Design a protein around this ligand. Structure first.
Ligand SMILES: C[S@@+](CC[C@H](N)C(=O)[O-])C[C@H]1O[C@@H](n2cnc3c(N)ncnc32)[C@H](O)[C@@H]1O
Ligand SMILES: [Zn+2]
Lengths: 164, 122
């Protein structure tokens, strides 16, 4: 695939975001791909959308586009919320979907760099959601599993993280 | 890229905040939904970032700011109708962002800010 296309996983993240009613924030849509989540977010927020995949950015629904590797080029002090449907697929290092060992390599890199006040992260059962929660706690985030949903292939967990 | 992004981007090499300086090959005006920006980034040093942007875009006449517009915004940041219009109402399609400390360059190509495939200038 040239870029990651909207799937049941993305729609469960979108459904959870919808119920939260995020409004009046500066939101980073990390791994925006072609911007399906950005499209929903920009209705109530100012959104910066980033991806490693230039092809997806070049066919983006539209927004404020940055090609970047996670958050290194982002000033996190300026961002209220980060939303991330990450490459979570175990045992591949495909640049779009691959999460390598446990499907957790990008997730783990993200958790160890994230400092914004609030985050929404999607994970699957194979990533070991509890280890993700734990790592987030270690980073100062109070966490909770906003939503669990079985989809075609696996079960999706939406993690909400917030600093006190 | 719209200039409000200058409140959100940073050099990925320097471990402290630095100033990213804009070079603009071409820019288009954009119609001015939610427009929130990091006001403090544009107020500090008497509106340094704004002055920097105004200089970078001096050959672009689609939209404009003035000494006064900037000074007054620094006074009353609550009155940012003109600032928002400048920061959200312009899109740099072709250009560059340069870290003033290490000279790292982020090309801007087709309005996308490229922070992965960088250029050195020092
Ligand atoms: C599973 S896809 C999610 C796409 C989209 N937001 C959605 O929900 O449908 C993960 C996305 O992260 C991007 N990605 C992979 N590694 C990245 C990285 N290191 N930094 C930023 N984005 C990355 C991929 O290109 C891909 O678009
Ligand atoms: Zn630098």
């Amino acid at each position: 695939m040239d870029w990651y296309e909207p799937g049941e996983d993305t729609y469960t993240l979108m459904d959870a975001l919808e119920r939260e009613g995020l409004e009046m924030k500066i939101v980073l849509d990390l791994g925006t791909s072609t911007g399906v989540i950005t499209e929903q977010l920009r209705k109530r927020n100012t959104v910066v959308s980033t991806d490693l995949n230039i092809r997806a950015l070049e066919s983006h629904r539209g927004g404020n586009l940055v090609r970047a590797d996670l958050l290194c080029s982002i000033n996190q002090e300026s961002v209220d919320v980060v939303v991330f449907n990450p490459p979570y697929v175990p045992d591949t290092d495909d640049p779009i979907i691959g999460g390598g060992y446990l499907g957790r390599e990008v997730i783990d890199r993200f958790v160890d760099a994230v400092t914004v006040g609030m985050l929404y992260l999607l994970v699957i059962e194979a990533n070991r959601p509890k280890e993700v929660l734990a790592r987030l706690e270690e980073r100062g985030y109070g966490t909770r599993i906003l939503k669990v949903r079985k989809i075609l292939g696996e079960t999706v967990y939406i993690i909400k993280g917030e600093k006190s | 890229m719209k200039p409000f992004l200058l409140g959100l981007l940073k050099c990925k090499r320097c471990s402290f905040m630095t100033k990213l300086i804009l070079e603009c090959e071409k820019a288009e005006s954009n119609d001015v939904d939610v427009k929130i920006f990091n006001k403090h980034m544009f107020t500090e040093n008497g509106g340094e970032r704004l002055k920097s942007l105004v200089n970078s875009l001096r050959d672009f006449h689609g939209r404009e700011l003035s000494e006064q517009d900037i000074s007054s915004f620094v006074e009353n940041p609550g009155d940012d109708e003109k600032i928002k219009e400048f920061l959200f109402g312009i899109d740099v399609v072709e250009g560059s962002l340069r870290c003033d400390m290490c000279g790292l360059i982020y090309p801007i190509k087709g309005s996308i800010v490229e922070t992965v495939d960088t250029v050195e200038s020092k």
